[PDB]
């Protein structure tokens, strides 16, 4: 209810802020917190080192609502065609975030929630077995 929700939102804001400040000092709130910001950092580094190539490829995106899923699916299934690796997983997140940014830029904000669902499913059904075989996200954090 609305009363409980204000309590929950306050708690979430605190945890978010403390998690961030811990991370700035090489510490972490929790294992999941460490994963989230290893991923944020890895994506930033990927986009920074490969700014020229990543900018270029994202510039080529042609999105409409009726073709967005087809596009997302063809790109990710090609990305993983010959296997999975941690670098490809980072590329996958970076690509999804770029797809979202493009969608909002083009006044297709409706696609943002759709892309998030498509990615979460992809993680569950395509990528999870490899991730689990390769030491889970904690291994990505160490790596």
């Amino acid at each position: 209810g609305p009363l409980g929700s204000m309590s929950q939102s306050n708690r979430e804001l605190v945890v978010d802020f403390l998690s961030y400040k811990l991370s700035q000092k090489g510490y972490s709130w929790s294992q999941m917190a460490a994963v989230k910001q290893a991923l944020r950092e890895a994506g930033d580094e990927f986009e920074l080192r490969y700014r020229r190539a990543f900018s270029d490829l994202t510039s080529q995106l042609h999105i409409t609502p009726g073709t967005a899923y087809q596009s997302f699916e063809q790109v990710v299934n090609e990305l993983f065609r010959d296997g999975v690796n941690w670098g490809r997983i980072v590329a996958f997140f970076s690509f999804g975030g770029a797809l979202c940014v493009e969608s909002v830029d083009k006044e297709m904000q409706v696609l943002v929630s759709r892309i998030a669902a498509w990615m979460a499913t992809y993680l569950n059904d395509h990528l999870e077995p490899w991730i689990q075989e390769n030491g889970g996200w904690d291994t990505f954090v160490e790596l």
Binding site: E45, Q60, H62, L79, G87, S94
Partner: peptide
């Protein structure tokens, strides 16, 4: 405009370069 196949090959290419830097084969 480059087709989705080109976008994906370019994305995988740099994902692989990024991987190779950090991860042992």
């Amino acid at each position: 405009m480059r087709p989705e196949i080109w976008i994906a090959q370019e994305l995988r290419r740099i994902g692989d370069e990024f991987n190779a830097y950090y991860a042992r084969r």
